[PDB]
């Protein structure tokens, strides 16, 4: 029974010592949806992949400008073409292609001086917060910076500043290796929140997210399939999320050398009480080695 | 409505809105770990107590990038009867079970490798109550919390901007439910969660457990009201409440600002990937509405 802390987490997690508890998407139904972004590969009829507005967004477009308006982007990507296909059957380009989408309207919303943080990510699962089956992810764009990104920004800067060192290009020293692809690493981190919990950190020291090219979107591709495929195998397909974190828009250079982006799967196999919400510290019933352990002896077979 | 961000110097982070709407025997009867005390005093027709949690999140048998497992995990059974809930009980036994937790903090406080005392209630499977009795628990940390820390470091800022303490201005700064002789429920203006409800006592004070016998019992009829309340208006959902105070060792020049209270959640809705990713959290309901829905409803 421990407390483990993280620079890029900056909060204590409580260690004390386990499995899961057509549409208006699909091609042709697009005017079921609401107004288009754009669509790869370009304007095809025959699309992989699209991104639309949300019909009920949690911030609206429609609004630039103690309280603030409730100005932002909140976008849909639709993953895939096909109903019954989830992100994790999708081959590593397929993937690519929707990281490579995220990059793009990431670029585009970055244009906005209004804009302070874009959180990117995916819900699988009712339970986990997915309202449809189609297969699809999201984001939403900011006018704040959120806390976890402000905590992240505070807990790597000191451990920067006393270790001179950036704590994520550390990962095979500072955390658990689960699997290792051509630019990136996925690893149980030491302070892990969650039980399960898995972080894909690309090898090379970038601060933000859309700084990704194609050939390591692919790479990034097969590690991000891998990982959600042996999750869904040793942990019984159970709902999930996973979010990029990446840096603010107006990030500085001061903060660059520690300030380094990465993928985040959490597999929702528990939930919270009053301690959690009454104190921000989580009680995680399982160590990252021993997830370590069993995620790298996981076979697909 | 309109989407709108709020944010307040008590959570000190922004939250999104975005919209009477809503809605949803036993080991401890009278062979637990062992008891701490019980009231009345060692009677065997006892009305609450107090014992340690069998498997601790935290062992008290450790004192001493990493810390040590070391802390205090204890459990408050607030109830003989098994079928009884905390708000059937009567304003009177509830004092008793706020004084009691008042009892337990006051020792826990003579560690000094304690810095922060967290009392929190689960009621309903989903909201993590393991078992049906009724009980709440206490769990002592070596460490000042995430929301402790973000709740200094906001209530400074606006102190040193007003010169006022937040929670003092609870009649002004949010929208007053109910109220008591030395409390007032309020829904608060950013509140993280739907049909989120603070119960503030009147009386600056930076500390839970400097509350005595007579605000226990008006604080035992408030609280009972709002968890009624909520299980009325709502349909009896699962719900937390916790008790948000000062840590062990806050400082005289943090007094000023720093002012207790206790939060309310009733469990309406789950969270998905973008909470997780920000920490910060989209409530679908403002508290002028949910204000106005809790002062119309009539038990
Ligand atoms: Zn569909
Ligand atoms: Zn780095
Ligand atoms: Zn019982
Ligand atoms: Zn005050």
Known sequence: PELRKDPVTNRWVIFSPFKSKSCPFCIG????????????????????????ENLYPALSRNLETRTIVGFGFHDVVIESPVHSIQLSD???????????????????????????????????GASAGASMSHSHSQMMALPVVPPTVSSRLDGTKDYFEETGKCCLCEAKSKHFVIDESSHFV???????????????????????????????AVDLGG?????????????????????????PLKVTESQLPYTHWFLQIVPQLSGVGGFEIGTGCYINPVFPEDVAKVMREVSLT
């Open 29 to 52: 139904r697009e005017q079921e949806c609401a107004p288009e972004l754009f669509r790869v590969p370009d304007h095809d009829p025959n699309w992989k992949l699209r991104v639309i």
């Open 90 to 124: 999708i081959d590593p380009v397929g993937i690519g292609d929707i990281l490579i989408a995220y990059k793009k309207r990431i670029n585009q919303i970055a244009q906005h001086d209004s804009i302070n943080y874009i959180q990117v990510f995916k819900n699988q």
């Open 186 to 216: 996925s690893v149980a981190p030491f302070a892990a929140t969650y039980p399960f919990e898995i972080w894909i950190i690309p090898k090379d020291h970038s601060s933000h997210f859309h700084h990704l090219d194609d050939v390591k």
């Open 223 to 247: 590690l991000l399939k891998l990982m959600l495929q042996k999750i869904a195998k040793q942990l019984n397909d159970p709902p999930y999320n996973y979010m990029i974190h990446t840096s």
